[PDB]
Design a protein around this ligand. Sequence first.
Ligand SMILES: O/N=C/c1nc(CCCCNc2c3c(nc4ccccc24)CCCC3)ccc1O
Ligand SMILES: *[C@@H]1O[C@H](CO)[C@@H](O)[C@H](O)[C@H]1NC(C)=O
Ligand SMILES: *[C@@H]1O[C@H](CO)[C@@H](O)[C@H](O)[C@H]1NC(C)=O
Ligand SMILES: *[C@@H]1O[C@H](CO)[C@@H](O)[C@H](O)[C@H]1NC(C)=O
Ligand SMILES: *[C@@H]1O[C@H](CO)[C@@H](O)[C@H](O)[C@H]1NC(C)=O
Ligand SMILES: *[C@@H]1O[C@H](CO)[C@@H](O)[C@H](O)[C@H]1NC(C)=O
Ligand SMILES: *[P@](=O)(OCC)N(C)C
Ligand SMILES: *[P@](=O)(OCC)N(C)C
Ligand SMILES: [Cl-]
Ligand SMILES: [Cl-]
Ligand SMILES: [Cl-]
Ligand SMILES: [Cl-]
Ligand SMILES: [Cl-]
Ligand SMILES: [Cl-]
Ligand SMILES: [Cl-]
Ligand SMILES: [Cl-]
Ligand code: NA
Lengths: 528, 532
Amino acid sequence: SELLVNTKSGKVMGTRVPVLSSHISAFLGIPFAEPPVGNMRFRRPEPKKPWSGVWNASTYPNNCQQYVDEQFPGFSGSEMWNPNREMSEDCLYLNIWVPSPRPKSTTVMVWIYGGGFYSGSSTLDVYNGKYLAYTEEVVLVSLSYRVGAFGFLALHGSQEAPGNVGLLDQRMALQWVHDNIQFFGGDPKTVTIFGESAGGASVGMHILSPGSRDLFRRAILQSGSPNCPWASVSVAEGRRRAVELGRNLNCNLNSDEELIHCLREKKPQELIDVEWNVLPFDSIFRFSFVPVIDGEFFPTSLESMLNSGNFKKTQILLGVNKDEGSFFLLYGAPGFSKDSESKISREDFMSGVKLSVPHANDLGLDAVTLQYTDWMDDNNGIKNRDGLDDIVGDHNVICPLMHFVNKYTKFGNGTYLYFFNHRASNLVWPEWMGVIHGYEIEFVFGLPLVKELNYTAEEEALSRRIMHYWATFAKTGNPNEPSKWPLFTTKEQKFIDLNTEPMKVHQRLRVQMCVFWNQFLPKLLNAT
Amino acid sequence: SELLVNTKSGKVMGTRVPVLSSHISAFLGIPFAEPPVGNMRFRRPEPKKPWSGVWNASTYPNNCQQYVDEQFPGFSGSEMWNPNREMSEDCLYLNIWVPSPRPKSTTVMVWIYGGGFYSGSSTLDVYNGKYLAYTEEVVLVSLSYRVGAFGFLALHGSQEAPGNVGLLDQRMALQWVHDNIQFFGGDPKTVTIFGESAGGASVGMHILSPGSRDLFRRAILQSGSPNCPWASVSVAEGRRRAVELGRNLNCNLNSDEELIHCLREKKPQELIDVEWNVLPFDSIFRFSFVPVIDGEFFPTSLESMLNSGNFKKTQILLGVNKDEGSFFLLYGAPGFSKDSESKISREDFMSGVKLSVPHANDLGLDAVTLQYTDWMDDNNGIKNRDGLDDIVGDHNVICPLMHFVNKYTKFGNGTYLYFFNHRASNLVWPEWMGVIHGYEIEFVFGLPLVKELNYTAEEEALSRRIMHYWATFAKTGNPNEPHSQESKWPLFTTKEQKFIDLNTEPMKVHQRLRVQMCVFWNQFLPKLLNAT
Ligand SMILES: O/N=C/c1nc(CCCCNc2c3c(nc4ccccc24)CCCC3)ccc1O
Ligand SMILES: *[C@@H]1O[C@H](CO)[C@@H](O)[C@H](O)[C@H]1NC(C)=O
Ligand SMILES: *[C@@H]1O[C@H](CO)[C@@H](O)[C@H](O)[C@H]1NC(C)=O
Ligand SMILES: *[C@@H]1O[C@H](CO)[C@@H](O)[C@H](O)[C@H]1NC(C)=O
Ligand SMILES: *[C@@H]1O[C@H](CO)[C@@H](O)[C@H](O)[C@H]1NC(C)=O
Ligand SMILES: *[C@@H]1O[C@H](CO)[C@@H](O)[C@H](O)[C@H]1NC(C)=O
Ligand SMILES: *[P@](=O)(OCC)N(C)C
Ligand SMILES: *[P@](=O)(OCC)N(C)C
Ligand SMILES: [Cl-]
Ligand SMILES: [Cl-]
Ligand SMILES: [Cl-]
Ligand SMILES: [Cl-]
Ligand SMILES: [Cl-]
Ligand SMILES: [Cl-]
Ligand SMILES: [Cl-]
Ligand SMILES: [Cl-]
Ligand code: NA
């Protein structure tokens, strides 16, 4: 039977899922690792011990314990990212969509959700692979990995909580696909990992980490980059945040073994309730527990790994949305409201800049202030709003990623750069937020193809172009079939807009500010 | 007679000269101080001892000893600024144009030439006061001061070479105008000083100097201001040059007295021949002997004086030209050529930034580079040549002056600020150079009214509206005439910072002149360098 497939851990049985007047096969909630519970919290994952019987794989799994956003109770635009299934620590499962009839050895794409390494679910509506699998005839996997202290508490020197363990869940799911995707009609020799935001950063980190290079073939990074400043901490820092989260729930502190004992006895929400109390700078724009540069998941510093070319040389397709900064000001800045136009007074703008660059000494702030101000019109509420929004976008995503693509492209076997700047016709957030990050995913997964979702014709049209770009890249290493998307070369730096209009080529994405972010400001703060 | 005038120092015979189908009275080469020669080299001027007989004031004086520009021999564009009379340390004289018939109690304007404090003459074709004195009915004076080492060699603590004696020359010439201009129909209560470049910076230095504030009434500063980076040095730095100038001359340096004795025996050109060797850096737009922050002529720092309000309160009219920097890149920067459009490669651009900001660490020059570059297009010669020109103009003239206008306006009794952007139709310098610094001056002095100098008719009009704006400012403290219906030049206020264009098309009123780079030059980079 199509939905009777026997894996190396036991058999699973799926479900026939409708999709656009046809059907595909879904295998939902397959366990790829033993539940990380009790003695095994904070621990490296261990693979799912094989089970007797048929696994009812017909409903989405649980979601990992995570902070739940209630800034806007019942607002669809923020609830679409909250967990939609019960939260459990028993949350390491993956989901597979397989075209019907079952293909023989075909391209698999594995989706890695973002949400800042504090949140995220495989089971959102926007991550529903039934459309991308069907329309592009690929096998689609979405994995899961633990987030928060459950996934990234780091006490280097300890093997009970070493850190990066949630990156290891993703690799174990990746290993599971490498071991079991042949049976679902997948081609293990052509796996394509892709994810957005913290998903983007994970895809980049598996390109970097030697333990992950051979478990996938190429990579798509949307609005995310392994060198982003919010994506890693040093070893010492991830310790002090573990140490203090201990003290912020009154734990034993003279060592590790006792501080970790004290944290496996606490209930899940207990740490989530105190999650954020460990952030060094007011900052607002950081996340408590994130990957650590431990010296073994990552052998060295990332910059040295990219100058040295110590990563996978393959094909990458990557890009950003126009306004990566909107979401983070709205939730944590002065004068940003989801109901006004959020025009920003100068002094509120000054506040943003100090929040926006956690670390900067006084001189580093005056640098950033001068580079985003128009001093013929510095009390213009709008371009003060738009200026600080750019600061966050430029510093936290766009320029961290251009740095990555520039260093990567010296060594890789191909690079494709996009700039996503279409605001969806049915977006529920205010216009001043522009092309909010995360809202390219709707198109990647072909939701505008669903007529009841009230997208336009040109957005259905735009979606299919993107899924084909993504799918053809996943099958061939290049999104085109012999109008053509140019390769990004070390010397000409071309990229493309993605929107409802005919494709157009530009060079040097936001170079003026990314010179400032990647070269000048680093040298200012190291000086003083 | 109209031409025999009996002063407090003796009688002077002048000459009746013509101008514009009429005639004016001129008094040329009148001495205002003892010849700073012999053992009086490097010392303060002493007032001219009064003479018997009638001083023949009919011909132009000598020019002070100075370097002579000879990059382009024969080339009028550069030789028009070279001395046109014999050079001599005997050079402290001054010239007066007086309307005819002679006025009763009329406005006096006193010109101070620029030349980087290393050069300049009162006697250059472009500083002929005959047209200005004539068409505005003001009494025009140009003075003189010793330039280079002779004027500004400064061994602070010594009384034999104190520094600033070049500035003190101009003060004693103004003291002379205070005491005698009335004998020529000039109101010593309504004297306007003005000058260009280093002449503008001196005007500003007399606004600051206590011993100078009472010898004029209003002020005018063109493409110069006291606080500019090339206009002052500290006591310590002026000393190490003075010493080093002696080292270059194999002098005894064990003591000032010995070092000044040694320096006073050498011939003028022998100093002039080494005066550049004392510069601390490969520089463009820097000169060896300049005023010093001594604690007498300047009680404290130019900055603290500007902040405490320790200066003369009046009306200043002041401004700059567009391409203040293009002269100095031509003579001192790589890739620039007089007979070429001078597209600057990135390599030559980087080199120019170091020559323009001699004093900065590399964090400094990365800052300057990052902020004058288009990175979408970093190897476009025109954008690079033009960017370097703006760097030099902004760092050295535009932004130091907009700092000054800002500080002064807090306390002054009125400020009028202009941006002069007319490339004269007959300029002999290539187009890339734009509106070269200095080339406002022929409009201020009304040479476009002379027909065989071949100006656009609308260049005559522009030269007449300016002279008017300037003499009207000198008379009343306001460039405008009330009653009139010509469009009005607004006051620069502490902030709505209005200023005007100066060209052949009608007057536009702009605000906040080059804020962005002047926030960079006046506020950010100084901070970066104090931390680094
Ligand atoms: O930007 N947030 C702004 C923000 N919100 C809240 C809402 C309640 C707890 C959410 N706890 C979050 C925290 C932070 N960042 C978050 C980002 C997204 C969702 C929740 C966050 C950083 C500072 C500490 C807590 C409190 C304080 C804040 O300062
Ligand atoms: C598996 O679970 C779903 C959801 O509860 C149920 O509808 C389905 O019948 C189950 N299948 C089997 C074989 O028990
Ligand atoms: C990729 O590698 C192949 C073989 O190693 C080489 O021939 C080809 O030119 C490379 N292409 C790019 C775009 O780097
Ligand atoms: C003044 O000097 C000039 C030349 O030196 C001479 O021609 C002129 O006659 C002199 N004037 C008088 C009054 O002697
Ligand atoms: C100048 O001073 C007079 C008298 O003190 C005053 O009335 C006038 O407002 C002042 N103007 C400016 C521009 O300072
Ligand atoms: C001015 O123009 C006339 C042409 O009418 C010419 O004869 C004369 O030589 C020109 N003079 C100068 C100084 O250029
Ligand atoms: P990404 O995971 O976005 C989630 C809010 N990242 C930019 C942190
Ligand atoms: P100025 O006197 O220009 C003549 C060389 N000064 C700006 C140096
Ligand atoms: Cl459907
Ligand atoms: Cl235990
Ligand atoms: Cl490898
Ligand atoms: Cl669009
Ligand atoms: Cl580059
Ligand atoms: Cl004439
Ligand atoms: Cl000495
Ligand atoms: Cl004011
Ligand atoms: Na001595």
